[PDB]
Amino acid sequence: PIVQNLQGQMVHQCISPRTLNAWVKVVEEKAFSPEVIPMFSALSCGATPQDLNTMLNTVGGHQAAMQMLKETINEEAAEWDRLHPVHAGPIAPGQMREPRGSDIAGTTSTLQEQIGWMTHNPPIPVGEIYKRWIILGLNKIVRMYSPTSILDIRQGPKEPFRDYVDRFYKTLRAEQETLLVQNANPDCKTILKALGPGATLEEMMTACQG
Amino acid sequence: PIVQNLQGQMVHQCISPRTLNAWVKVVEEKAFSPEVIPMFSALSCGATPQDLNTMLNTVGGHQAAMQMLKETINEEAAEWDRLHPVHAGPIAPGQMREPRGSDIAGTTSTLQEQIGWMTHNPPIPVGEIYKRWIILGLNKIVRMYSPTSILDIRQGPKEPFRDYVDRFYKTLRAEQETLLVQNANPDCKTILKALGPGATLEEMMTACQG
Amino acid sequence: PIVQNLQGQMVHQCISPRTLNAWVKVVEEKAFSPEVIPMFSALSCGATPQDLNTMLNTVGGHQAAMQMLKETINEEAAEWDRLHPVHAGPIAPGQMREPRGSDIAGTTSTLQEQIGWMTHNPPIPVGEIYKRWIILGLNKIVRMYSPTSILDIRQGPKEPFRDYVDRFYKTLRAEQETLLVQNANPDCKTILKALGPGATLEEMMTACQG
Amino acid sequence: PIVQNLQGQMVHQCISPRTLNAWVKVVEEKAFSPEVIPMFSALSCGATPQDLNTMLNTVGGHQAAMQMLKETINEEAAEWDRLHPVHAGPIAPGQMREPRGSDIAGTTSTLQEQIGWMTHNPPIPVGEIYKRWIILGLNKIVRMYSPTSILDIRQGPKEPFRDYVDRFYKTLRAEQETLLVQNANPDCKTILKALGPGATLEEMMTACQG
Amino acid sequence: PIVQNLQGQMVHQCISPRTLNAWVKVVEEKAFSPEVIPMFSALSCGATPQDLNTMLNTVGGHQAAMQMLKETINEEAAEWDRLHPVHAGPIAPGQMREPRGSDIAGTTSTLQEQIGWMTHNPPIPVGEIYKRWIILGLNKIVRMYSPTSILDIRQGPKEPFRDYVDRFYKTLRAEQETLLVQNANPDCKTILKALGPGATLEEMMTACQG
Amino acid sequence: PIVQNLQGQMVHQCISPRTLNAWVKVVEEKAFSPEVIPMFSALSCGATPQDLNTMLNTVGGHQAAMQMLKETINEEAAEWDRLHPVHAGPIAPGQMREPRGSDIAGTTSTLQEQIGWMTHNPPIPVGEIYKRWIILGLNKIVRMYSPTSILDIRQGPKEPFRDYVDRFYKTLRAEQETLLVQNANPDCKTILKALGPGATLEEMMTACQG
């Protein structure tokens, strides 16, 4: 990634073995659960497009999702080229050429070009632009691999209300209010109806706390 | 987080894989026990609002508590906006706009704006303000998920007094003096009554030490 | 803690996840054995009062001992206030107010005040003063939770003298010379009596080495 | 590897025990799966030819592949010598001799010569040139040890389409579009034919999602 | 320990949790085998007397050996006082008082006094002097706890010569040439006698290699 | 080891607990396999003679090999003394005396003398000279402890050619071309004879790939 050292300059440093292993492990142990996205965004802090491709390449298996990720990146890169057509001409000394979509994706750009864009003044954050495309595609993976719809999350007759709300918002986070009351069991729903339409979650969970 | 480097300047650096995993692990292995709060406060030392949301997002499961956390943050952010109304006008060069509630929560603020507020002189500690809101909500989770009341923590007829005091103040810490004597078993309570009203805990535990 | 960076200035840095976990683990795996005290003193090297409270707060369970620790800290803080009464008056620019007992314990003092006292010239080491109070209370926990008295550590008829001395000074360290000879078995005691009153431990262990 | 320190100079530093163990472990636990290549490229970030040989030497077993790696490196080194014949003559002060093929492979070059080439201005990146040769040979190992051809990856009659696409692109990545439709089971292939020739992967996987 | 930072000054830094745990673990898993001594000497690199006492204090159990260690340190400290009597008088500004034996052992000396002696010019290496006393006592522990004498290490009739030499020099290292030939089995001893009196170990092991 | 800090000066720093444990572990888990040598050479990057002795001393067991290592070091040190006789005379200020063989081996040299030689200009790399002697002796250990000769590595009648070449070059690496064809099974040898005398390994392995 590109980090700031002891001085005020942004400097490239190698991706660490701890970061490489942390990303490989969270994919192996959690697949494409919703919480894998912010872990990816945090592990790729300040990452260049090269580091982003590195993290995606080190993932073995789930190649259907990774291939869908390539398709999403290609779509966003093509939209970037439509909005930012490169203007031909010799690049002035001490400057950087305009990045294409494949340059932001690290396909047709070298490392020192990515360093040049990210450490430029003003910077061209090709890492954050690429990560935005990757997270966009990864969110498409999560909603797609979400097994349960929110309409099917119903509280059991003897299920504690806390466990039901745990399953409700876990499913809701994957699929990406008043349904929480409707899908509660008869005994809890009677308590929630008499509680009021503007009750908070802690007020509702306290009322059905058995 | 925002840290001080070799020079005297406060500088942003990426959240470490060790910090990310340490927070995910303590939630998996201890849920919402009272000691999880100071671990969160320590793991988020110097954290920006972005790092605070990152730590909260990486938590899979317990979404009922995390949704209640969003409600608490929204309440505190709305109270911040009531106390600090943003005054319109162009921002002077080399300065920062006034943060809203959603800016402190990292919702409507970029990373370099959070860096700008936290490294300002005088600093606007949006990280400490947000962490104060998160810890406030997390404390509401702990007292809510506390299973046992302090009125039900009683010393067994053959339970050692040390183990009883261990259960007493562990329960008292979750729920957030003279009850300790009243809930002791008959044999120990006789010893404590004749000991005096101003006895310390080590004096009481020594007297009932069997 | 407060550490010295590349320059000669003492600078605050966040407590590390390794230090946080190392302290939580040694308490879980060794409770209040005597060797837990120097591990605490080493893990809290250069710690502020905030870091000291953090380490104590992250400990789940053993709340009877931790509550006794609060009582000891309150006693030492009250003695500090008796010896150092704060004199009222406006604090001069670039200076620090006099700390109270609760300020050294981190109760009524902010982090930058603790940084101000510890990095002052001359420094007010509120961290070392607080740690001295904590170690004092922790030593009261160790002697109190010591199960065996030194009078009951006797060498078995067939117990090797090395194992007996191992149990003797382990018990003696928890409770905090000529008794070692008296509590030896008859065969070893006969050897030690004829050895001389000023024999060293390696001379005594060699003589009873069987 | 050669890294940039606090100043702007590229400086050699020793290969870390974490990097050494991370490379040994991924070879032991994944052999020559496709994802081992980008892990090697990332673990050898900024590596000198000496570090590259070190990583290859620490691998025990798989010596057939490692011997094939030597043959590939010898071929690329001989092509480098054909394209870059060394011109004899005394080397000017403060300069570097032209590297041979065996110099880039770390065979006939010392460490400070590799430091001299890599930290030169303009630099002679003997590390990136050698790594390019190693990755080239390692890719020959992957395609060679690929057990299954893409023609034999067919969807089972009851196999979920997601699992079939997972096996398809995993095999395709090792061997290095319309075949995905042809190798689908009859029920899914009927759905894909009526879907259109320009359907994306997420559009195809959604249509056969059962 | 006392380490050199980015500048040329020797600066104190806290003992790390990794060093603390590494020393506790090697004592738990290897007790007082000979190889524990160089691990101690390496883990205490640049250690102050405070760090040396910390490492010794964190060791739970083996208190018979640790008590013998105190006796050895007291003997060496008393010999230091006999050779270096402290001369009374006011200490000049910016200087250090002469250390006693208990000052080198960290008993009657503060941390900043140990920093003052070790970072002095010329330095008074109280850490290396104390470590020399500790290693001296620890070597007395190893030879004392050595279970087997070198006279009893004999090669079995069917024991491979390599395994016999492994046991021979392992025992010899704990107790601290021609006996290796005499304690070999009859078949190997016949080969070694006809080999010559000045044969090397690899020449002897090759001759009895079966 | 001796490393370069933020400035351009070579500075000593303590051997890390990670390096100490990594060397102890690879010896415990791999003994004297060929791949242990480059792991030793990498873990001792920039090591002083003191660090080299430390790594060798921390190895428990295998004392027959370690004693043979002492004999090899003594031979190379005696050859160094024959080639470099020390010339008597007072050492000029700010200079270093000429090292003997035992000085390079760390036997009769202090740490600051090793620092003086290694950080000299021009440097006397006593660490690399000693490591060259240690690796030389360690290679004698590997060839000596190699159990199988290359003449006995033959392909089984049903053994896959890949597994046979894996055993061939693994044995060849320990003992330190046309024999690979001669030791193949009859069916594979018929294929290799008709393939040509100048076939590469990947060409031969592909031809016998069954």
Ligand SMILES: Cn1nc(NS(C)(=O)=O)c2c(Cl)ccc(-n3c([C@H](Cc4cc(F)cc(F)c4)NC(=O)Cn4[nH]c(C(F)F)c5cccc4-5)nc4ccccc4c3=O)c21
């Ligand atoms: C190769 N490349 N090609 C693309 N688009 S394209 C014309 O349509 O094919 C594409 C795009 Cl958009 C983005 C980036 C890459 N990129 C990758 C990618 C990263 C990646 C992106 C992603 F979104 C998911 C993912 F896992 C990895 N690594 C691979 O793709 C590896 N891989 N290989 C095959 C093939 F064998 F079947 C795969 C099937 C799924 C994954 C496969 N590494 C690199 C390594 C070194 C130097 C450059 C690059 C590089 O530039 C791009």
Ligand SMILES: Cn1nc(NS(C)(=O)=O)c2c(Cl)ccc(-n3c([C@H](Cc4cc(F)cc(F)c4)NC(=O)Cn4[nH]c(C(F)F)c5cccc4-5)nc4ccccc4c3=O)c21
């Ligand atoms: C999205 N956002 N929205 C809020 N308030 S609001 C209008 O009423 O909805 C809200 C508030 Cl107050 C604070 C902060 C966020 N924030 C989050 C939050 C953090 C968070 C706070 C918390 F207190 C608990 C927690 F776990 C996480 N992450 C999420 O909330 C993830 N998540 N998603 C759903 C949905 F799918 F059901 C959830 C249900 C429980 C948790 C859910 N990440 C971000 C990631 C990148 C850039 C910005 C942000 C961000 O700004 C805020």
Ligand SMILES: Cn1nc(NS(C)(=O)=O)c2c(Cl)ccc(-n3c([C@H](Cc4cc(F)cc(F)c4)NC(=O)Cn4[nH]c(C(F)F)c5cccc4-5)nc4ccccc4c3=O)c21
């Ligand atoms: C709260 N506070 N109060 C005290 N003294 S007082 C009036 O008589 O109550 C007291 C004292 Cl003397 C010292 C320091 C604290 N301090 C603690 C303490 C540390 C601590 C000290 C100790 F010696 C043992 C220990 F484990 C933790 N954390 C707690 O005490 C947590 N805790 N809570 C309850 C209650 F719910 F039953 C407990 C029962 C045992 C432990 C409990 N964290 C803090 C976190 C953030 C900002 C400030 C603080 C703080 O200032 C002090």
Ligand SMILES: Cn1nc(NS(C)(=O)=O)c2c(Cl)ccc(-n3c([C@H](Cc4cc(F)cc(F)c4)NC(=O)Cn4[nH]c(C(F)F)c5cccc4-5)nc4ccccc4c3=O)c21
């Ligand atoms: C020795 N050397 N020789 C080559 N080419 S050559 C004339 O035809 O033989 C060759 C080439 Cl091309 C590249 C580099 C090396 N190099 C190696 C290599 C690295 C390596 C490359 C590779 F592509 C695969 C791999 F695993 C390791 N280490 C070895 O090869 C170890 N090894 N030894 C035998 C023998 F005993 F059978 C082996 C059989 C397979 C691996 C073997 N380490 C070194 C260690 C210290 C100082 C220099 C060097 C060095 O310069 C080169």
Ligand SMILES: Cn1nc(NS(C)(=O)=O)c2c(Cl)ccc(-n3c([C@H](Cc4cc(F)cc(F)c4)NC(=O)Cn4[nH]c(C(F)F)c5cccc4-5)nc4ccccc4c3=O)c21
């Ligand atoms: C206390 N002190 N006293 C000595 N000599 S003396 C008059 O004859 O008793 C003695 C000597 Cl010579 C050297 C150093 C110490 N020192 C220790 C020692 C270290 C130590 C040395 C050693 F060689 C072995 C070892 F394990 C630890 N820690 C202890 O000794 C802990 N301990 N306590 C008892 C008692 F309860 F039985 C023990 C029995 C065996 C170990 C015991 N920590 C300290 C912690 C904080 C501030 C100062 C100190 C300190 O200055 C010295």
Ligand SMILES: Cn1nc(NS(C)(=O)=O)c2c(Cl)ccc(-n3c([C@H](Cc4cc(F)cc(F)c4)NC(=O)Cn4[nH]c(C(F)F)c5cccc4-5)nc4ccccc4c3=O)c21
């Ligand atoms: C002691 N010393 N002596 C040698 N040569 S000599 C006259 O003929 O005996 C010899 C040589 Cl050539 C090289 C270096 C050492 N050196 C060692 C050595 C390293 C070492 C070298 C090696 F090649 C293998 C190995 F494992 C360790 N550590 C030891 O040898 C430990 N050890 N002890 C006995 C005895 F008890 F049987 C052993 C039997 C096998 C290993 C033994 N540590 C030290 C620790 C602190 C300060 C100095 C030193 C030191 O200078 C040298």
Ligand SMILES: [Cl-]
């Ligand atoms: Cl790392």
Ligand SMILES: [Cl-]
């Ligand atoms: Cl995976």
Ligand SMILES: [Cl-]
């Ligand atoms: Cl794969």
Ligand SMILES: [Cl-]
């Ligand atoms: Cl831009």
Ligand SMILES: [Cl-]
């Ligand atoms: Cl409930």
Ligand SMILES: [Cl-]
């Ligand atoms: Cl569910």
Ligand SMILES: [Cl-]
């Ligand atoms: Cl609840």
Ligand SMILES: [Cl-]
């Ligand atoms: Cl990390």
Ligand SMILES: [Cl-]
């Ligand atoms: Cl969880």
Ligand SMILES: [Cl-]
């Ligand atoms: Cl979730």
